[model samples]
Target: GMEDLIPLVNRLQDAFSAIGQNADLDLPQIAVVGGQSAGKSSVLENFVGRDFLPRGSGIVTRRPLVLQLVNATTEYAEFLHCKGKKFTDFEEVRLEIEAETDRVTGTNKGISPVPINLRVYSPHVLNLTLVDLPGMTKVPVGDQPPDIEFQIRDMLMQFVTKENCLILAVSPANSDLANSDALKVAKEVDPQGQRTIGVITKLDLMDEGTDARDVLENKLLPLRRGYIGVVNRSQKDIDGKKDITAALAAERKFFLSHPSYRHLADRMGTPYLQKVLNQQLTNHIRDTLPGLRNKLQSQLLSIEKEVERVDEMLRMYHALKEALSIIG
Candidate 1:
């Protein structure tokens, strides 16, 4: 039953990752889930190496942002709704996200399961699809719907419950380790810890002298995919208009300089997280596709068998009709 499908699938992923290439593969995607201020936006921005996401205080992302990052020679973003119009200006992409969110969700702070498909082609990032859902919030803020919590959770579960989806559970380091809403919800769906990658964000913002060494080591709330810690730009840094590249550099420096995190410097931080995520996605794709191919093959074989039986029955009926006509 064993055939060498991994090499063929590996090349398939590489081809799909490149620019302007059309492949009829519906690759599995990573689903980003976390609280409203869990640094989900920062993590995504870090991956893109750009500040193209809309940022605000309350309910900033009211719709799922299905972002597909393709490694292309020329950098541009194209929205599924607005086809043929390549947005070269990253700022416009941010604006477009806001406007599009408003288009479906409106300013009343409603959430929609209908995702906004955005493809960003860049030489800076690896090819991966990340579905950034609306941040999970417990209470309704100003102008937000009364059942905002239920809506968000329901929407998030829809994405994560799918077998093809890989969960990127983002939890801030400063939060209680035992009481992470994101992980709790993810656990409800992915009980075995398979397909879940825990991301400890805001490592820099944690209490003084405290570190997430245990969590990073996967001793605390261990998962099959394990966990990685990341340091995102603080609110003040974002308010000061800090560039993502500078923040990434600062993140590397933070991990390297901090005595507690120094040993894990090479493995910690955003760049390493990105690399690991890319590899995880690649590995996930490689593992998922071969079985899927076999399943489709089995289905086709059954269909062919049915077709042959039908043809045989039709031929027998035709023979019987010819015999009756000769008797008449």
Candidate 2:
């Protein structure tokens, strides 16, 4: 019985070996985008199965970091600072910085334009590479006379061009979801409406018993359509409010009573707020997500088609081998 089991296991190993050989091809790349303090790094950490990236309070990631997972013995992560020709060989730049940390740090407190790379042996999702970019906030260089906020914005816009890239725009609950800078960037990055998902982080910060679905439909939907999908309700506190609807209602009441909130209300007009309240009461009767889901599903199906194409190619190769054997 043991001998028989050995043979069966050998055959299974061979089958898996063939599959693995075939899978050693191209992989998918995903890019995450959002404002500062939006938990973008946290999401990547969860997806990548590692806590290699830095995260904490007032810990702003001022550089764009690219993470690559390879099938090599020694895993290498590269950080590239400064754009243009210097960024062509990211690995080399990474080593240069590692060797001379003082040079990079001495000139501009090490906060200058630099890219970070991390390597690790990942048993899960080995074919995917995750790129974590600096949040859309201006990092002031030491004694720079002119403001380079626009320049930084332009540089960020350039980072959005990657094949199979998915943009995760993160925002907080009880905030203006539409007028957010993160939403604006999402619209530009995925202008053609390709792969973009809106993640509403820190939903737990809102009042308890809030209805996220209602808030999504009434407040978030009309503002940005076709681009925003998937909201992440990350409750920072162990025990906090989880209901999105209740949170929205409480926020409205607070704004109505608080005079300080009038500044924002005056700009956007109270009518929009009234509309949000009415829509919430209606439970998004006029909302439609079929179109949005259909769009997302179509993109997913395209990926499936590519997988099927690979399978067909392998089958054809095997058939050709069989034909030659028969002829011989």
Candidate 3:
């Protein structure tokens, strides 16, 4: 009944962040990705209970936002490894994200594979690491170049190819699920339908007298990880400076009051998503531990061998030089 796996999960995420790619280890992580305007950022903010992402109009997230949320005894404090600063408030965090995006990709609309790593300690959030990737674009715009679509596709593939990755595919419920670019990409990597969790957003935005209940039920496409629904904050709420507190309350009310969603509310919503996400990430970590240990040991052995060879070369050089010198 106790959710105590967060500490161990946090340690694993920290270890991976420090040694990722360098050590050839694929530590478990959640890759949150979707097409633009898919409400990806909103879902993440709801999970952390804060509006930390840069919110505007088009292509704000030019780079991947590698966000790791941790539960601490202390209050909401954060560290930005990329920016090399601490943020007591989330507003500054949002500014830095925009700044860093410009620094990496310049003022142009082009995208970069570089990621901004932000770690926040909050008592409200469950232990989790989420990589918010740039939304998939069908065609490149402005100075983004014609091959921009290929670049974004390749980047998304790289993240999802890892053995330890669990894909979080976000799609709007009002949109045709058959045309979901996010799900199409996810289904390619996870043809077995395993390790992919579909998130159906914008339920309220569906046409009047119509609901996305069938799509959420996998009537359109089957996913082994299944689908979870989340109701996010409206643009009006954001413009009026309404925080996630009111957003969350409204979400709860939507599910509780809606006749179609009332029963499924237990299985759906952001809160349930968090619980299932935590459990899935923990399990992913456990499954990767043995492989991670073996790989680490191999890495260590390779380093030791190189160091020993260098030391032997140094000793040989000194011994050979001493035989030719008077002080030898």
Candidate 4:
């Protein structure tokens, strides 16, 4: 792996020198890992401004797909399973699928997982690449006859590294925040407690007034010192549910009346979820370096008169000390 990494680093160094005289840019690599159908692909689609990953009901990504979006235009290479072999062109690499499964029944048609690779150039961003791993739930577990779930977990743990890469683990809102096997894997990978952020997806599926904020703060916040965040709040509601008040009221009433609807509502509360997400994002941005600087300045000005008083006391101390020395 180091041998393969060396040439890539050298190329990046050369490119950086060519752009600027002597400046070097340290690019951050982010690896997204999560359970099956955790909206990882949807997040990437939003980031890249395209729907590259196939989505919809029961459409699982059967391979480890690596998407490299860099600054320079270069030839693309596809390596099979990253087996420390030479890279081959995209067309030459075999597109192999080990098994397939039906969406409704969740029955596998006997296919195995493979790795997919892609490389592209972006003009706006500099030296950034997004790596998307296969759905962890699809991989087969041990001894049990080709357990897809086990395979998924194994594959994800193998690729995740704590040194420089950031891991963004996505999970559904209704799912238990604690005792999450996926988040556990993430913690193990990032043992130093750095560069791992939890992303709670599919908030739109939640009901109103569910206290999702309290859940996140109390449950997952302690795990990573409040590095957890959420996204796609307004964007998740495509059918104007977020915008239309009357429609929301009707949905809320329906959720309140029926028992089954109430249970679903408790699980998929949207209003409370949105409130928590908005509060968290706002708090995070407001607590940045610039915000901290402004806060410090405000506090200093509030004690300006007291500071002057302290200066006068220091001057009096110096004067008294000199007078005592002269008397002695």
Candidate 5:
């Protein structure tokens, strides 16, 4: 009946894990990758309405952060590597990320694909999965490995290339959108340009007399998913310990009041992004899941056909022994 469908969806998700990458099940994900100083962290913080990421001058996020957000009545958080430790205070979460980052990749500018799993239960968010990769860089600062650029790109490509992954390519408004490292890598995987969503960060910092209206309007580079603009907190604002609640309210105001961007009120901001992603990912799950289920069922039946061939002599000896035992 209708009651069976709830668990059916869960079984399909389990099947995806069991099959691994072989099934090409089109795992739905949001891969956020960007160049150095592209406000990637800021955008994520604004999205979650919490500043939990470590702040520093150099590469702070050494390992790929696989964050799974859950909707909960009460606030809660935990990490996979911390041995069942639960953090109620968000600041502790930030420090934990910093400590874990140093523990895995050392206190230098190294990159690791090994991920830290963070599950946050917040009422402020929808049920979504967001992966924030290490920011791309041309030079390895401090004692970082020399080939850091290629290494980071390779690790990030692993996420975006998947058929179901939606690349959240973050870039600053001041920078040339034509030469974005995040977009370049995303394109390598999504050459047809169907799986990438452009997030315009630093929209408030555009050159004194210019704005990102053209780029957001698809005047510069075209994308299938289109571009959505967002404004994130500045370093000064971060230093002053500005609350993200105010930041979110300000974001709402900025888009609603700006003369040019006001028209895009429905398409801009972190909340809008989350809603759009939730619908899209849900549809992908439902549409493609039946085929995976049928594929497994057929394989199960096919494998059931294979059997152990009996030795010709052993079969007769067993039958003769059975006859002799019955006669006795």
Candidate 6:
């Protein structure tokens, strides 16, 4: 049935990724993109209700981290890089990402276009597959090559340019909306804003008197998929090992109590953001899956035609056998 479309696609994608083969089905997935300090990883952490992403100053995620969250009764993780191994502890998931990143990019601080696919099953998660991409960079470090920036841009365009990949362009509330690297890059591929969802991260870090009311309300830099504002734990809080649940609670409180945001509290925060993404992905799949269904139907018809041809050949052979016996 098409009722479990997301899970079906999830399994097919994971299967193909594990075998080092492309499904070639053009499955739809949310690709997260933002700047170096946009709290991109934190938003993903809040989605799974776990703290399991590598944190650093410059280029923590050297490769695209493809995450598929499956709803289940148990909690565990499995990586495409290494099969038949379940990571019960989420901390191991973080470590595996770093080790795998180093495996390809090396210690010289480079990037890889090949993604790391990870499927996490948890009772608290929703059915969704998202790609966490490397943050956009402007200048190269002393040890890095000058063309590293171009490489990252090319890699990002490779994914976002695909019609099946929904762009999740993240921007911090503290930055100028017009100068947002994420939104600017997204607009390049999605000029109509038809397949991009705007995310405002670090909502609490904005200046004292200013707020991102217009952006969250969809009045500024409007996108067809709309915008969602979320408050994630700060670097200081994460450094101190603060729990994500606590950060979520604080997030709700911020929206509910803020003067400019209290009216939109119902639609704000990480929990609401997760729900929006889940529903968005569901609708996106439903809309884009007609082609896949048609493809399957065409294959089925082709197979039945072959079967009919074989049946006719069998009938002709039987008739010839009877005639030869009579003549003999």
C-alpha lDDT score of every prediction, in listed order: 0.75, 0.41, 0.73, 0.44, 0.70, 0.79
Looking at candidate 4, the ten consecutive residues that score lowest on lDDT are: 18-27
Estimate the TM-score of every prediction: 0.81, 0.45, 0.84, 0.47, 0.80, 0.85
On lDDT, the stronger of 4 and 5 is 5
Query: What is the alpha-carbon lDDT for the whole of candidate 6?
Result: 0.79
Cα TM-score of candidate 5: 0.80
Worst lDDT 10-window in candidate 2: 20-29
- Regions more than 4 Å wrong, model 2: 1-28, 56-59, 69-106, 109-114, 138-148, 161-165, 214-219, 222-328
Better of 1 and 3 by TM-score: 3
- Candidate 3: tens digits of C-alpha lDDT, residues 229-307: 8889878887888888787777888878777778788888888888888888777766765565565555545555665
Clashes of 6: 0
Over 4 Å off, model 6: 1-3, 19-25, 292-328
**Mind giving the per-residue lDDT tens digits that candidate 5 earns over 24-142?**
33345577889978888887777567888888777778876767676679777877666568888889999988887888678445777666767787898776666788888998777
* Regions more than 4 Å wrong, model 5: 1-26, 107-109, 290-328
For model 6, the run of ten residues with the poorest summed lDDT? 319-328
Ten residues in sequence with the least summed lDDT for candidate 1: 16-25
- Model number with the top TM-score: 6
lDDT of 6 by residue, 86-174 (tens): 99888999999989888888765787776788889999888877888898889987677677787778778778887777899999999
Error of 1 at 245 (Å): 1.8
Residues 1-328 of candidate 1: C-alpha lDDT, one tens digit per residue: 1122323333333333332111122335688999888989999998998889998778877777778787789999988778689999989999999998888778556777666778888999877667788888888878888999998898788778877678999999998877787898789988989989999998888898788988888888999988888988899988898988889899899888988778888888887888788788777866776554554345445555665656543443343233223222
Question: What is the per-residue lDDT of model 2 for residues 1-328, given as tens digits with 9 covering 90 to 100?
Answer: 1212212222222232233211111112234566666767644544443344443433235444544443334333433233233232334544454443335444443333333443333344233344455565556545422344554455456555432345555666556666565667866756744555455555435565553444344344534322222223244421263444443344345444434333343322122422322232122211222232343345445555665656755643443333223222
The TM-score that candidate 1 achieves is 0.81
Report the candidate with higher lDDT, 1 versus 4: 1
